[PDB]
Amino acid sequence: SPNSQYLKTRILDIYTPEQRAGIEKSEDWRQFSRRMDTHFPKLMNELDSVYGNNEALLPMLEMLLAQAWQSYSQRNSSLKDIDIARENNPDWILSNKQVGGVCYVDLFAGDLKGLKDKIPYFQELGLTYLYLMPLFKCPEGKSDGGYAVSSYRDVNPALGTIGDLREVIAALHEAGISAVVDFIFNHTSNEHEWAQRCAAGDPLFDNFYYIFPDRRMPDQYDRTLREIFPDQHPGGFSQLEDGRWVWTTFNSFQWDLNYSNPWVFRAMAGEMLFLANLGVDILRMDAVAFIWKQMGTSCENLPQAHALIRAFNAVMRIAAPAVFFKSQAIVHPDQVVQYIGQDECQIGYNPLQMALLWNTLATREVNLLHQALTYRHNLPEHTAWVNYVRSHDDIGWTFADEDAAYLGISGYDHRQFLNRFFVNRFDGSFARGVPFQYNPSTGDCRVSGTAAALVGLAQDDPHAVDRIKLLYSIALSTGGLPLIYLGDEVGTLNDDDWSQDSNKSDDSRWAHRPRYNEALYAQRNDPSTAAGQIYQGLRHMIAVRQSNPRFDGGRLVTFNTNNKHIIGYIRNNALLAFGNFSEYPQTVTAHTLQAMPFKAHDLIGGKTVSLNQDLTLQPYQVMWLEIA
Ligand SMILES: OC[C@H]1O[C@H](O[C@H]2[C@H](O)[C@@H](O)[C@@H](O[C@H]3[C@H](O)[C@@H](O)[C@@H](O[C@H]4[C@H](O)[C@@H](O)[C@@H](O)O[C@@H]4CO)O[C@@H]3CO)O[C@@H]2CO)[C@H](O)[C@@H](O)[C@@H]1O
Numbered sequence: 001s002p003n004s005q006y007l008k009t010r011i012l013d014i015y016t017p018e019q020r021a022g023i024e025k026s027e028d029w030r031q032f033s034r035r036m037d038t039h040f041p042k043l044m045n046e047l048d049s050v051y052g053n054n055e056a057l058l059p060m061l062e063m064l065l066a067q068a069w070q071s072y073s074q075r076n077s078s079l080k081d082i083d084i085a086r087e088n089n090p091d092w093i094l095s096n097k098q099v100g101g102v103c104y105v106d107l108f109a110g111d112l113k114g115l116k117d118k119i120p121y122f123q124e125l126g127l128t129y130l131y132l133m134p135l136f137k138c139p140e141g142k143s144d145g146g147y148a149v150s151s152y153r154d155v156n157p158a159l160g161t162i163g164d165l166r167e168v169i170a171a172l173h174e175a176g177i178s179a180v181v182d183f184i185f186n187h188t189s190n191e192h193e194w195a196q197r198c199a200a201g202d203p204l205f206d207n208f209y210y211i212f213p214d215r216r217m218p219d220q221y222d223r224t225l226r227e228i229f230p231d232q233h234p235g236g237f238s239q240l241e242d243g244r245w246v247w248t249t250f251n252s253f254q255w256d257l258n259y260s261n262p263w264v265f266r267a268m269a270g271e272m273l274f275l276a277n278l279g280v281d282i283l284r285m286d287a288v289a290f291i292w293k294q295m296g297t298s299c300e301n302l303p304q305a306h307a308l309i310r311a312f313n314a315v316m317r318i319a320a321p322a323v324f325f326k327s328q329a330i331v332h333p334d335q336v337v338q339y340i341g342q343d344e345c346q347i348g349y350n351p352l353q354m355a356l357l358w359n360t361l362a363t364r365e366v367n368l369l370h371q372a373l374t375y376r377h378n379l380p381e382h383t384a385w386v387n388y389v390r391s392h393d394d395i396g397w398t399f400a401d402e403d404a405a406y407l408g409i410s411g412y413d414h415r416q417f418l419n420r421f422f423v424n425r426f427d428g429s430f431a432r433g434v435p436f437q438y439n440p441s442t443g444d445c446r447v448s449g450t451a452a453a454l455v456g457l458a459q460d461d462p463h464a465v466d467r468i469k470l471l472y473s474i475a476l477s478t479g480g481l482p483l484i485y486l487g488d489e490v491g492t493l494n495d496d497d498w499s500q501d502s503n504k505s506d507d508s509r510w511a512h513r514p515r516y517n518e519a520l521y522a523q524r525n526d527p528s529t530a531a532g533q534i535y536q537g538l539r540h541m542i543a544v545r546q547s548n549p550r551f552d553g554g555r556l557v558t559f560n561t562n563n564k565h566i567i568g569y570i571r572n573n574a575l576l577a578f579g580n581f582s583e584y585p586q587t588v589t590a591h592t593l594q595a596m597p598f599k600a601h602d603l604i605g606g607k608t609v610s611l612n613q614d615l616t617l618q619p620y621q622v623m624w625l626e627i628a
Pocket residue numbers: 362363364365409410413414417428583
């Protein structure tokens with residue numbers, strides 16, 4: 001394998017002797033050169049572990065590195081300052097000051113210019129992180145909400161132009177807000193030029209996807225493949241009009257890119273650099289679990305998949321240090337955490353905590369939640385969880401069967417209950433969600449519906465508002481970067497047109513993808529409305545989280561409350577949080593609190609709480625007690 005010095009000499013060969021001398025003395029090159037030496041070894045090692053002695057590895061690497069230099073050279077000065085800042089502050093992601101929000105530009109603000117006008121609200125809310133859903137060109141009609149990309153360079157015309165996106169990102173930076181977008185690197189739409197040219201037999205795009213002559217291999221692969229959208233098609237393949245079959249983990253119009261082809265890595269690395277120079281701070285690595293296939297395996301979380309992401313990481317460490325990755329692996333907890341690392345994905349969605357928040361509301365028992373916060377919360381240094389309550393996607397019950405078994409709980413039976421409860425098919429349920437992808441051959445099913453709809457706000461359940469504040473309080477204080485599903489802060493309900501919409505009716509996730517509700521937002525400052533109660537409640541926790549250093553970092557120590565309905569944990573050995581998941585008053589005995597100070601200030605209610613006597617929490621009450 002070649003080394004950093006050798007490759008750098010060849011990168012400079014594109015310059016005339018006179019030009020070369022000038023480049024080598026420039027600041028840009030000095031920085032690039034330094035980063036090459038520091039991070040190239042990792043890049044080479046990761047790529048070698050995946051491609052081995054492939055003849056195209058060296059040629060691809062030099063092409064990519066030449067691109068990396070040009071990209072860094074062109075990179076805007078303001079972005080390079082951010083590169084330096086984060087390069088010397090890897091834990092910026094762990095700061096309690098961070099609070100993120102996510103929205104669809106079209107649903108929330110119409111278009112990019114309209115989004116730009118919403119920035120003042122984002123600052124009002126206190127956001128320092130804004131994640132925007134798929135913005136680029138995609139097939140008209142069904143595109144899996146923009147996740148079927150037909151062009152990584154051209155913005156969806158309905159949203160604006162690439163120029164408007166640049167302006168938006170710069171406006172967010174001016175407002176002290178980081179820009180976060182998806183890096184849909186596991187697949188493209190079947191209308192993408194690469195897909196068309198590959199299928200057409202263009203030699204320049206040979207093996208860019210996984211195409212087969214018949215069902216021989218697809219049937220073999222399907223013996224071990226998990227079905228993501230069983231409603232759309234069985235297994236992981238779709239048939240082309242000409243009779244061939246293509247690997248399609250998700251919708252039939254989404255073709256899995258073939259990373260076993262080094263030129264695919266190079267191609268996508270190029271797209272990553274493009275986004276990088278737009279000033280994107282964080283890239284949501286869509287479907288990281290599926291980027292490597294191997295017959296006989298689930299084709300999820302394979303070693304090469306992890307290696308490739310680490311290879312991508314190195315490319316950013318070299319040509320755009322400010323760009324961090326956000327893993328979005330919704331898989332077994334043991335696999336989820338493997339994507340999180342300083343040299344892989346610095347942050348990642350925490351589906352375990354999210355799924356258990358909802359589980360606890362249904363069961364009223366914090367057992368599983370406590371277990372998770374105790375054994376699966378702390379992460380390696382320089383990494384953090386992205387804690388959330390809801391997202392653009394359905395809710396999956398991704399807790400570990402092995403973990404549940406320890407608690408005497410049958411995963412299969414328990415999920416059946418949860419699914420029934422949240423789709424209002426369980427006596428007394430307050431949830432008003434709808435099913436998603438019920439799989440008759442496995443019994444699996446997921447849930448769609450907004451946070452407000454799932455807690456009973458649709459029917460005006462008197463506990464609805466408190467439930468919302470309770471869930472968000474935990475995502476906001478356990479340690480990690482909290483990501484609010486914009487619209488939740490005012491109690492937005494399900495969209496009630498999706499089921500009638502020809503392009504959405506077969507995807508219930510659209511139920512929880514409502515448009516900006518002018519009426520609810522207009523009530524955010526009115527304490528007598530649910531919108532106001534929710535907004536002020538959440539805004540206060542946001543204010544406290546960001547100004548109080550006791551919430552800093554991502555580490556926590558659980559506290560045994562001795563009450564199966566109350567969750568408890570301590571941050572920095574100075575903040576004791578209690579959360580009552582019961583609709584009835586619940587007590588934490590004075591005996592249980594003997595090690596605590598006689599009195600402590602509750603940052604939530606603002607009152608002084610006595611801990612030398614039984615502490616009774618009202619239904620769904622949350623307390624953030626300063627014990628130090
Ligand atoms: O305040 C609301 C209700 O609270 C109480 O009922 C709770 C239970 O206390 C919880 O434990 C839970 O019960 C679920 C259980 O979590 C779930 O696993 C499932 O249990 C199955 C089990 O999986 C299966 O292996 C086998 O053992 O059968 C079990 C029973 O079907 O389903 C349980 C619910 O049926 O949630 C309920 C509901 O919140 C309290 O007892 C109620 O009176 C009260 O209304």
